[PDB]
From a paper:
EE is caused by mutations to the gene (HGNC: 23287) encoding for the ethylmalonic encephalopathy protein 1 (ETHE1, also known as sulphur dioxygenase, SDO) and correlates with increased cellular levels of hydrogen sulfide. ETHE1 is a non-heme iron-dependent oxygenase that catalyses the biochemically interesting oxidation of glutathione persulfide (GSSH) to give glutathione and persulfite [Eq. (1)]. ETHE1 is reported to be localized to mitochondria where its activity is linked to electron transfer chain energy generation and is of central importance in hydrogen sulfide metabolism. Sequence analyses predict that hETHE1 is a member of the widely distributed metallo-β-lactamase (MBL)-fold family.
Recombinant hETHE1 lacking its 20 residue N-terminal mitochondrial targeting sequence was produced in Escherichia coli and highly purified (≥95%) as determined by sodium dodecyl sulfate-polyacrylamide gel electrophoresis (SDS-PAGE) analysis. hETHE1 was crystallized using the sitting drop vapour diffusion method. The final model (orthorhombic space group P212121) has two chains representing the dimer in the asymmetric unit. The hETHE1 structure reveals an αββα MBL-type fold with two central mixed β-sheets, each containing six strands, surrounded on both sides by helices. Non-denaturing mass spectrometric and multi-angle laser light scattering (MALS) analyses indicate that hETHE1 is predominantly dimeric with some monomer also being observed (dimer to monomer ratio ∼10:1); quantitative gel filtration analysis indicated a mass for hETHE1 intermediate between monomeric (26 116 Da) and dimeric (52 232 Da) forms in solution. The total buried surface area at the interface is 1950 Å2 and the calculated free energy of binding (ΔG) for the dimer is about −37 kcal/mol. The active site of each hETHE1 protomer in the asymmetric unit contains a single iron ion. Interestingly, three of five characteristic MBL family metal-binding motif residues, His79, His135 and Asp154 (corresponding to His118, His196, and Cys221, BBL numbering system), act as iron coordinating residues in hETHE1. Three water molecules complete the metal coordination. Residues His81ETHE1 (His118BBL), Asp83ETHE1 (Asp120BBL) and His195ETHE1 (His263BBL) are present in the hETHE1 active site, but are not involved in metal coordination as observed in the current structural data. Analysis of the enzyme surface reveals a channel, comprised of residues 163–166 and 226–232, leading to the active site that is sufficient to accommodate a substrate molecule of GSSH; this channel is apparently conserved in the A. thaliana ETHE1.
Residue numbers in the entry:
A (entry chain B): 17 to 253
B (entry chain A): 18 to 251
The structure:
Amino acid sequence: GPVDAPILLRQMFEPVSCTFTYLLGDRESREAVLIDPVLETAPRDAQLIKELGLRLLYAVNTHCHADHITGSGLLRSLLPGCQSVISRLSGAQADLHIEDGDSIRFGRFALETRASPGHTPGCVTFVLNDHSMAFTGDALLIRGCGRTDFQQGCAKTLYHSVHEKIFTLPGDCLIYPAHDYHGFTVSTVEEERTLNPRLTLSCEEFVKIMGNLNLPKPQQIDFAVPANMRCGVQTPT
Amino acid sequence: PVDAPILLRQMFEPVSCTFTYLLGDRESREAVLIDPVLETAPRDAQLIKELGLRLLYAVNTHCHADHITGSGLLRSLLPGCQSVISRLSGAQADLHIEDGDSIRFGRFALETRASPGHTPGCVTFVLNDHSMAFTGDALLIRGCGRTDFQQGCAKTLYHSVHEKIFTLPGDCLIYPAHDYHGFTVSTVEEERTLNPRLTLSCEEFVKIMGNLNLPKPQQIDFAVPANMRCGVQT
Ligand SMILES: [Fe+3]
Ligand SMILES: [Fe+3]
């Protein structure tokens, strides 16, 4: 029986791309926001929103993804009034564009935009005004981080992004990444800045490891990125 | 709200689609673990040490047919911790429980509510707060567990949920043991109103659950015997 109506938070999971989608909502004003929605599960998302009696104000992407197609464009039609949002530095199409310091207001809540490039130049982190939660996209993963060998990625930039924008948050602040490949669903700032095998290294040691992963080009990057630059629109049927 | 909030971590096992839940008291450093899987026990143990917790109980909601419990192996990796399962499951464990029993860890408590149906040994763990309920395969998100194996009974399942789960506060969270559609959490309010199966008449519910004509899970002939003996295979 806490005095204030707790924020509504629902974490969904797309098993193939291992992508996390996040639904945030004000329980009282029934306004909501959707972070990193996937195209294939867009109608599922929309169904839950209607079932919860919520109204979707924004469909937001932490960055231009290369592993799946965004559902933000589809949601504009499935939920009239909804607006697509993405960083200006992503260079990707959307109804609205944000940059560092921008605030996405929904109900009595707000997601504060902190630019955290590295994985891509357009990566941003969404911190709840409470500073109790942070949605880090692929900038910071649980016990890891996004690769920096593609999409004009820079390891040195990533290292500084996380240390200056995410690790500077309260230790108790939750970490909700855009992906997880090991069965986790959440972490904390305190955990990562203490235990993250990569980000606890020096910047030097970090850059040298990120360049030696020698991972392969993702399967969908050729079809995923362009579609996301156009807010999800791809050749039909 | 002066005492620290409960620690809660939801892990996911992709092939089995199983949810393992780590619950802990931040101030007491005492923890429990609900439905741990064998293939991810080392991972779970490592996380417990990283968080600086001491695992008291490795707990199972019921005797699983889809995977092998990590409760056995965790008794080795984290000495002092004990396996816990319902007496009615007929399964081997260090401790056995029944409706009404509390599993204490720090200032927190899991109220055991006997919720048979999917199996005779199914129980739902309700946080003393009444803000969370770990429902096993009794109540799934927008569904429920199959009732055609492990001596399951549909009429019992319907009653269990309606009497033990739907009686909880509407805003109480629902954390199932599985999900096959990308969800992680639900609420009592939602399932009470939206669960396509359990919102039906009991009589209707008993009918359709038998009509599914699904194939028995592949892992059952190996999971259940191993889980009846705390993870020991063959
Ligand atoms: Fe990415
Ligand atoms: Fe089961």
